[PDB]
Amino acid sequence: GRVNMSEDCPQILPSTHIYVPVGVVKPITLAARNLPQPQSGQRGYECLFHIPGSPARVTALRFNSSSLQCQNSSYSYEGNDVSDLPVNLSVVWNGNFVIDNPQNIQAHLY
Amino acid sequence: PAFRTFVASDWGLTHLVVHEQTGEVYVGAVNRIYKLSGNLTLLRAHVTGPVEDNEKCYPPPSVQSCPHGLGSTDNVNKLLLLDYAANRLLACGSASQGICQFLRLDDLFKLGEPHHRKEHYLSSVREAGSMAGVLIAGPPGQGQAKLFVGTPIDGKSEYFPTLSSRRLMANEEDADMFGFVYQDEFVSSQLKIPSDTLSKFPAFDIYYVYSFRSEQFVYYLTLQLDTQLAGEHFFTSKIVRLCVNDPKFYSYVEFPIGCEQAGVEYRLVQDAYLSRPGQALAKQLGLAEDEEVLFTVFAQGQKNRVKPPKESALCLFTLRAIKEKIKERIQSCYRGEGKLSLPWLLNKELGCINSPLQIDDDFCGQDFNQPLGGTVTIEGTPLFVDKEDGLTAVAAYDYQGRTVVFAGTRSGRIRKILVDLANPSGRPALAYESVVAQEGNPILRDLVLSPNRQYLYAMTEKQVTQVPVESCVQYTSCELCLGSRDPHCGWCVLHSICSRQDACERAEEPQRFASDLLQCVQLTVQPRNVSVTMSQVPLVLQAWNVPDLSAGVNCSFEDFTETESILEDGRIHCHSPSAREVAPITQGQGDQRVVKLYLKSKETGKKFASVDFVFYNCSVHQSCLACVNGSFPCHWCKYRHVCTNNAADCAFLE
Ligand SMILES: *[C@@H]1O[C@H](CO)[C@@H](O[C@@H]2O[C@H](CO)[C@@H](O[C@@H]3O[C@H](CO[C@H]4O[C@H](CO)[C@@H](O)[C@H](O[C@H]5O[C@H](CO)[C@@H](O)[C@H](O)[C@@H]5O)[C@@H]4O)[C@@H](O)[C@H](O[C@H]4O[C@H](CO)[C@@H](O)[C@H](O)[C@@H]4O)[C@@H]3O)[C@H](O)[C@H]2NC(C)=O)[C@H](O)[C@H]1NC(C)=O
Ligand SMILES: *[C@@H]1O[C@H](CO)[C@@H](O[C@@H]2O[C@H](CO)[C@@H](O[C@@H]3O[C@H](CO[C@H]4O[C@H](CO)[C@@H](O)[C@H](O)[C@@H]4O)[C@@H](O)[C@H](O[C@H]4O[C@H](CO)[C@@H](O)[C@H](O)[C@@H]4O)[C@@H]3O)[C@H](O)[C@H]2NC(C)=O)[C@H](O)[C@H]1NC(C)=O
Ligand SMILES: *[C@@H]1O[C@H](CO)[C@@H](O[C@@H]2O[C@H](CO)[C@@H](O[C@@H]3O[C@H](CO[C@H]4O[C@H](CO)[C@@H](O)[C@H](O[C@H]5O[C@H](CO)[C@@H](O)[C@H](O)[C@@H]5O)[C@@H]4O)[C@@H](O)[C@H](O)[C@@H]3O)[C@H](O)[C@H]2NC(C)=O)[C@H](O)[C@H]1NC(C)=O
Ligand SMILES: *[C@@H]1O[C@H](CO)[C@@H](O[C@@H]2O[C@H](CO)[C@@H](O[C@@H]3O[C@H](CO)[C@@H](O)[C@H](O[C@H]4O[C@H](CO)[C@@H](O)[C@H](O)[C@@H]4O)[C@@H]3O)[C@H](O)[C@H]2NC(C)=O)[C@H](O)[C@H]1NC(C)=O
Ligand SMILES: *[C@@H]1O[C@H](CO)[C@@H](O[C@@H]2O[C@H](CO)[C@@H](O[C@@H]3O[C@H](CO)[C@@H](O)[C@H](O[C@H]4O[C@H](CO)[C@@H](O)[C@H](O)[C@@H]4O)[C@@H]3O)[C@H](O)[C@H]2NC(C)=O)[C@H](O)[C@H]1NC(C)=O
Ligand SMILES: *[C@@H]1O[C@H](CO)[C@@H](O[C@@H]2O[C@H](CO)[C@@H](O[C@@H]3O[C@H](CO)[C@@H](O)[C@H](O)[C@@H]3O)[C@H](O)[C@H]2NC(C)=O)[C@H](O)[C@H]1NC(C)=O
Ligand SMILES: *[C@@H]1O[C@H](CO)[C@@H](O[C@@H]2O[C@H](CO)[C@@H](O)[C@H](O)[C@H]2NC(C)=O)[C@H](O)[C@H]1NC(C)=O
Ligand SMILES: *[C@@H]1O[C@H](CO)[C@@H](O)[C@H](O)[C@H]1NC(C)=O
């Protein structure tokens, strides 16, 4: 679990844009690198969506060191003012450990 | 001495296993999996437990949402298997539809825990030990490591297979784990419970007790339900087998197994243990060196698998004899005779297809006459029967030929049995019994000898206990040493201790080590009785069953004095102590003092052989009656009115 090289860091890699319609049950598959196996007394993964209106906490599954997925859920924002809203997402495990997001990958709620 | 022990601080224990290289002991428990040293010190503790979950939920909450309410439940270690090849431990739990864990061998680091796919789920069943299996491997690049594993199903016929042949990839993170060896839309390397058989008999289920790899196969001792024995539940204990190289699963065989003792039926397996017999039992059971044997434990009748009877019997099966019963049964169905006869699997009875074949022990099954059952129930050779305290577990081993058997009890006791049916004796005799959790914590099936085979780790609900196979040093005397009979023990004459052949220095030499009670040190002194008034008396010593003492010997009357002796013929000549030395002893004890005259060997410097030696005092008698009509040679002087050994010390003649 020692990181000495910058390329070996826990980070989320981008895919072609994350499209999310409001009020539709969807899974959100992610790719990444060197995702840790949670150890003794350590919980699993969650996706946290930073929507000013409503912030959603959805638990996820780490399939291997290189892929994640938040589970079937629907999302919304209260306004009807902007069609395309990009949202900061943070991928957490064991409650508060936020994985690094270099490209600052966002979820588009349309 | 004290028994080395590991206590279960909070929860119950379920499984134990020993690493053949290190002697590290791994211990499966509810919510915990421990690594322990050879002497049972805690080395590492893994939390596997209390998980928020629900048994009714398919794929567990991690993968899909379940409408059933969740609660913090306990995760029971169902299984534990050492994968030496991939430097790890397969630590299969429950309470997640039975997801399996991989812990690294030397530190318990979770390498992987696959739970996305449906194969990564093993069974809902929350019961400990109702599961078993074996790990089998080939070299990297070749046909990879496989796991054969049986489990109960709880009626979830379509979710899980009871018996399966599954893949073990080198990457624990690899998704391919616990996938079947060969999957087809027609036939997969698995065996499911048919839905029709669950509709007919409501809660039929297969509970897997023990399992082992032998030569090229894989056996399982199982418990099943009433299917030709809706009503009530009555169980039938059976043997199962497969070829290791049979992806199609056509080799499946299933014979009922038990044994009878004076018209009393024993049909419920509690444990088993595959072993060797060593030169002794092998010869008079008629076997070749590498021929295997199966010790077992059965309870009386076919009632209450959940809580069996006290009445229990340790039986025996030679694998050559079970191999012949299976070969005999197959060369029979390939004569076209009768049906396959396997109730729970095939509800409508398909018939035996005749065909010309070379029926061998190498036969791995064919397309037609398929998976098949057994008619003639295989009877075992009984050995020992407990009636007041139920046997629970068993192990065995080869020691210098003689075959030692270990037997757990409901009380928390271990029996150390020499099996002597093939040996000279009338029937196999108990040698010794020992205590672990005396209060009445039962011993569990997982009972493993160490790698050096010096100890035997004995597990309870609540504690692991290092019970030595050999601990002859508890024996104080040649007469008790060789009297216990537990075959590791001999009297190392010159060291005056009881222990094994390899532990007694120079044992190989003549008379230095005693193995039959008749070899015991036996000693005699010619002048048994010597008066206090005498000094430096010559005594002759006859001793038999003693090694060459040309090394030198001293006589020590006790830890008081020590006189040098010289050797002639088959006799030892030494002297009594001086009057100056003798009286310091006899002062206080009056009439006489019986004293244990030892021999102290020059080579060892330890007292080994003893005799009753009497120091008598005449003078202290103060009356004629005490003097003469006592027990000793003493003379009374009428006139001086004194008692003495010398006639001349008397007043005068008359
Ligand atoms: C074999 O067994 C004999 C007899 O049992 C042992 O000989 C005894 O030795 C002990 C010494 O440790 C004596 O005990 C002490 O006695 C003295 C006083 O002794 C006087 O009284 C005697 C009793 O009637 C009497 O026999 C004595 O006379 C003898 O001596 C003269 C001279 O040698 C001789 O000529 C006679 O023929 C007698 O032999 C004598 O008058 C006393 O001081 C001690 O008592 C003190 O200590 C005790 C305990 O602490 C305490 O309770 C008292 O209060 C007091 O303070 C002590 O008792 C004993 O007298 C001897 N027995 C005899 C019959 O004489 C001896 O152990 C063995 N023999 C050998 C050769 O080893
Ligand atoms: C780490 O773990 C991750 C995630 O668990 C793995 O990523 C997965 O990779 C697999 C490839 O093995 C991907 O599987 C593919 O899925 C396609 C399904 O898409 C359909 O889905 C639904 C339901 O079926 C349809 O309604 C919808 O219309 C889609 O069409 C399949 O079509 C693919 O099958 C094809 O390829 C295979 C293998 O070559 C062939 O056998 C088939 O015939 C077919 O041609 C394929 O199975 C999967 O998408 C990824 N998972 C996720 C969640 O997205 C990684 O593999 C793993 N990484 C490492 C390094 O181990
Ligand atoms: C005290 O210690 C002495 C050790 O010397 C013990 O004495 C031995 O006692 C047993 C019986 O208790 C005797 O065994 C018997 O032997 C009988 C034959 O006896 C003749 O042969 C003897 C040996 O060859 C010989 O000693 C003996 O002569 C004796 O008697 C003479 C006449 O009285 C006397 O002048 C001598 O000095 C001598 O003492 C005989 O000719 C046999 O018939 C019996 O069936 C039995 O086997 C031993 O012989 C005794 N040993 C000796 C050397 O005399 C004694 O038991 C101890 N005392 C106690 C109370 O325990
Ligand atoms: C873990 O288990 C191991 C064994 O599985 C154990 O370590 C061993 O301890 C024994 C003694 O219990 C040691 O054996 C000694 O060997 C030396 C020779 O190098 C002898 O000098 C010793 O003799 C002494 O003890 C005798 C019996 O008590 C006396 O009669 C004699 O006078 C001596 O004083 C003795 O035979 C041995 O050193 C190790 N074994 C190995 C392989 O090193 C230990 O109990 C456990 N350790 C832990 C940390 O849990
Ligand atoms: C077998 O028997 C022989 C002969 O019977 C015996 O030989 C004895 O050896 C010891 C030495 O170990 C001798 O004792 C010594 O004598 C001198 C006087 O000459 C004393 O000053 C010494 O005593 C001191 O040391 C003692 C022990 O530490 C103390 O208790 C004491 O206070 C003194 O400081 C010294 O030990 C002894 O003389 C002979 N015995 C006779 C009868 O002469 C030997 O024990 C045995 N042989 C073997 C190889 O074991
Ligand atoms: C959504 O995420 C974006 C991007 O992460 C947030 O906007 C910006 O966040 C960055 C942090 O990377 C802030 O940059 C900071 O700049 C100062 C310059 O003095 C520097 O010292 C810091 O080290 C840091 O890099 C930046 O302030 C911030 N932008 C604004 C306008 O405040 C954004 O906050 C997120 N959206 C929501 C709604 O929270
Ligand atoms: C003295 O020795 C004699 C003879 O050995 C003992 O005689 C015993 O006398 C009783 C009668 O009271 C008999 O019933 C026993 O059978 C006799 N015993 C033996 C061995 O012959 C007597 O006990 C001794 N007396 C004393 C005071 O020591
Ligand atoms: C929810 O996700 C699962 C797994 O990806 C999928 O089988 C199912 O189609 C999804 N359900 C809905 C309603 O979108």
Short mmCIF file of N, CA, C and O in Angstrom, two decimals, chain B residues 464-514:
data_model
loop_
_atom_site.label_atom_id
_atom_site.label_comp_id
_atom_site.label_asym_id
_atom_site.label_seq_id
_atom_site.Cartn_x
_atom_site.Cartn_y
_atom_site.Cartn_z
N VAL B 464 -9.02 -23.51 21.83
CA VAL B 464 -8.09 -24.40 21.16
C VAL B 464 -7.13 -24.91 22.22
O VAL B 464 -6.77 -24.16 23.14
N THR B 465 -6.72 -26.16 22.10
CA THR B 465 -5.90 -26.79 23.12
C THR B 465 -4.83 -27.71 22.53
O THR B 465 -5.14 -28.71 21.89
N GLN B 466 -3.58 -27.35 22.78
CA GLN B 466 -2.43 -28.12 22.33
C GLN B 466 -2.21 -29.34 23.21
O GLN B 466 -1.51 -29.26 24.22
N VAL B 467 -2.79 -30.47 22.82
CA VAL B 467 -2.63 -31.73 23.55
C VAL B 467 -1.52 -32.57 22.94
O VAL B 467 -1.61 -32.97 21.78
N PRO B 468 -0.46 -32.87 23.72
CA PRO B 468 0.65 -33.64 23.19
C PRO B 468 0.24 -35.07 22.90
O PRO B 468 -0.41 -35.71 23.72
N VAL B 469 0.61 -35.56 21.72
CA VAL B 469 0.41 -36.96 21.40
C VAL B 469 1.11 -37.83 22.46
O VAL B 469 0.50 -38.75 23.01
N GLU B 470 2.99 -37.23 22.64
CA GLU B 470 3.76 -37.94 23.65
C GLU B 470 4.06 -37.01 24.82
O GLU B 470 4.58 -35.91 24.65
N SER B 471 3.72 -37.48 26.02
CA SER B 471 4.04 -36.79 27.25
C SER B 471 4.27 -37.84 28.33
O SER B 471 3.60 -37.86 29.37
N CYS B 472 5.22 -38.73 28.06
CA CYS B 472 5.51 -39.85 28.95
C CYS B 472 6.16 -39.45 30.27
O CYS B 472 6.23 -40.26 31.20
N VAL B 473 6.61 -38.20 30.36
CA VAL B 473 7.35 -37.74 31.54
C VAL B 473 6.45 -37.61 32.77
O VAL B 473 6.93 -37.49 33.89
N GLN B 474 5.13 -37.66 32.56
CA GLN B 474 4.17 -37.75 33.66
C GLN B 474 4.29 -39.08 34.41
O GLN B 474 3.72 -39.25 35.48
N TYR B 475 5.02 -40.03 33.82
CA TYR B 475 5.21 -41.34 34.42
C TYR B 475 6.49 -41.41 35.24
O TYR B 475 7.59 -41.16 34.74
N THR B 476 6.31 -41.73 36.52
CA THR B 476 7.36 -41.61 37.54
C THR B 476 8.19 -42.87 37.73
O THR B 476 9.32 -42.81 38.20
N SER B 477 7.61 -44.01 37.36
CA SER B 477 8.22 -45.30 37.66
C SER B 477 8.17 -46.22 36.46
O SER B 477 7.18 -46.23 35.72
N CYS B 478 9.23 -46.99 36.27
CA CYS B 478 9.27 -48.02 35.23
C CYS B 478 7.97 -48.82 35.19
O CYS B 478 7.45 -49.12 34.12
N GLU B 479 7.44 -49.13 36.38
CA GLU B 479 6.24 -49.95 36.53
C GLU B 479 4.96 -49.26 36.03
O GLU B 479 4.04 -49.93 35.56
N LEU B 480 4.91 -47.94 36.14
CA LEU B 480 3.77 -47.18 35.64
C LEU B 480 3.97 -46.73 34.19
O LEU B 480 3.02 -46.73 33.41
N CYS B 481 5.21 -46.36 33.86
CA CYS B 481 5.60 -45.98 32.51
C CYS B 481 5.08 -47.02 31.51
O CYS B 481 4.15 -46.75 30.75
N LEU B 482 5.66 -48.22 31.56
CA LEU B 482 5.28 -49.30 30.65
C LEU B 482 3.92 -49.90 30.99
O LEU B 482 3.46 -50.82 30.32
N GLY B 483 3.27 -49.36 32.01
CA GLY B 483 1.96 -49.82 32.44
C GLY B 483 0.83 -49.07 31.74
O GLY B 483 -0.28 -49.61 31.60
N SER B 484 1.10 -47.84 31.32
CA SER B 484 0.12 -47.02 30.62
C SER B 484 -0.18 -47.58 29.23
O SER B 484 -1.31 -47.48 28.73
N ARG B 485 0.86 -48.13 28.60
CA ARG B 485 0.80 -48.80 27.29
C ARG B 485 0.79 -47.88 26.07
O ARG B 485 1.09 -48.36 24.97
N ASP B 486 0.44 -46.60 26.23
CA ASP B 486 0.43 -45.67 25.09
C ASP B 486 1.83 -45.59 24.50
O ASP B 486 2.74 -45.03 25.12
N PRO B 487 1.99 -46.15 23.30
CA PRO B 487 3.16 -46.84 22.77
C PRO B 487 4.44 -46.02 22.63
O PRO B 487 5.50 -46.60 22.36
N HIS B 488 4.34 -44.71 22.80
CA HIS B 488 5.51 -43.83 22.69
C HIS B 488 6.47 -43.96 23.87
O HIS B 488 7.64 -43.58 23.78
N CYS B 489 5.96 -44.51 24.98
CA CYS B 489 6.64 -44.47 26.26
C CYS B 489 7.51 -45.69 26.54
O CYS B 489 7.06 -46.83 26.42
N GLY B 490 8.76 -45.41 26.90
CA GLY B 490 9.71 -46.40 27.40
C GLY B 490 10.46 -45.87 28.61
O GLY B 490 10.52 -44.66 28.83
N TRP B 491 11.02 -46.78 29.42
CA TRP B 491 11.79 -46.38 30.59
C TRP B 491 13.26 -46.28 30.21
O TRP B 491 13.90 -47.29 29.88
N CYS B 492 13.79 -45.06 30.22
CA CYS B 492 15.20 -44.83 29.97
C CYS B 492 15.94 -45.09 31.27
O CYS B 492 16.14 -44.18 32.08
N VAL B 493 16.35 -46.35 31.45
CA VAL B 493 16.80 -46.89 32.73
C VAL B 493 17.74 -45.98 33.51
O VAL B 493 17.44 -45.61 34.64
N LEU B 494 18.86 -45.61 32.90
CA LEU B 494 19.89 -44.86 33.62
C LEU B 494 19.55 -43.41 33.92
O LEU B 494 20.16 -42.81 34.80
N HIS B 495 18.57 -42.85 33.21
CA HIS B 495 18.09 -41.50 33.50
C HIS B 495 16.87 -41.53 34.41
O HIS B 495 16.41 -40.49 34.88
N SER B 496 16.36 -42.73 34.66
CA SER B 496 15.16 -42.94 35.45
C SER B 496 14.01 -42.01 35.04
O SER B 496 13.38 -41.38 35.89
N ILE B 497 13.77 -41.93 33.74
CA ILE B 497 12.64 -41.17 33.19
C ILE B 497 11.92 -41.96 32.11
O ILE B 497 12.47 -42.90 31.53
N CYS B 498 10.68 -41.55 31.85
CA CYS B 498 9.82 -42.19 30.87
C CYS B 498 9.67 -41.27 29.66
O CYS B 498 9.22 -40.13 29.81
N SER B 499 10.09 -41.75 28.49
CA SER B 499 9.99 -41.00 27.21
C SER B 499 10.25 -41.90 25.99
O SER B 499 10.50 -43.10 26.14
N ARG B 500 10.20 -41.31 24.80
CA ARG B 500 10.35 -42.05 23.54
C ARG B 500 11.79 -42.50 23.26
O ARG B 500 12.73 -42.04 23.91
N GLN B 501 11.94 -43.41 22.29
CA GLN B 501 13.25 -43.97 21.93
C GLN B 501 14.27 -42.92 21.51
O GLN B 501 15.43 -42.96 21.92
N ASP B 502 13.83 -41.97 20.68
CA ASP B 502 14.70 -40.91 20.15
C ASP B 502 15.11 -39.88 21.22
O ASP B 502 16.01 -39.07 20.99
N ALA B 503 14.44 -39.92 22.37
CA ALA B 503 14.71 -38.99 23.46
C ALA B 503 15.64 -39.57 24.53
O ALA B 503 16.25 -38.82 25.29
N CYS B 504 15.73 -40.90 24.59
CA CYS B 504 16.64 -41.55 25.52
C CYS B 504 18.02 -41.74 24.89
O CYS B 504 18.19 -42.54 23.97
N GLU B 505 18.98 -40.98 25.40
CA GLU B 505 20.37 -41.06 24.97
C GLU B 505 20.86 -42.50 25.09
O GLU B 505 20.57 -43.17 26.09
N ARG B 506 21.58 -42.97 24.07
CA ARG B 506 22.23 -44.28 24.09
C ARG B 506 21.24 -45.45 24.20
O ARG B 506 21.64 -46.57 24.54
N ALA B 507 19.97 -45.20 23.91
CA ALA B 507 18.92 -46.21 24.04
C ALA B 507 19.19 -47.47 23.23
O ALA B 507 18.81 -48.57 23.63
N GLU B 508 19.86 -47.30 22.09
CA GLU B 508 20.17 -48.40 21.17
C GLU B 508 21.03 -49.50 21.79
O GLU B 508 21.03 -50.64 21.32
N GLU B 509 21.74 -49.15 22.86
CA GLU B 509 22.66 -50.07 23.53
C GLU B 509 21.91 -51.10 24.39
O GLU B 509 20.70 -50.96 24.60
N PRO B 510 22.62 -52.15 24.87
CA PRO B 510 21.97 -53.21 25.65
C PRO B 510 21.40 -52.74 26.99
O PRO B 510 22.11 -52.10 27.77
N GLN B 511 20.13 -53.07 27.21
CA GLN B 511 19.43 -52.91 28.50
C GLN B 511 19.26 -51.46 28.99
O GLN B 511 18.79 -51.23 30.11
N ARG B 512 19.62 -50.49 28.15
CA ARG B 512 19.61 -49.07 28.51
C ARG B 512 18.22 -48.45 28.45
O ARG B 512 17.98 -47.39 29.04
N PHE B 513 17.33 -49.12 27.72
CA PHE B 513 15.97 -48.65 27.49
C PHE B 513 15.05 -49.86 27.65
O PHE B 513 15.33 -50.94 27.11
N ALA B 514 13.95 -49.69 28.39
CA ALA B 514 13.00 -50.77 28.65
C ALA B 514 11.65 -50.49 28.00
O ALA B 514 11.13 -49.38 28.09
#
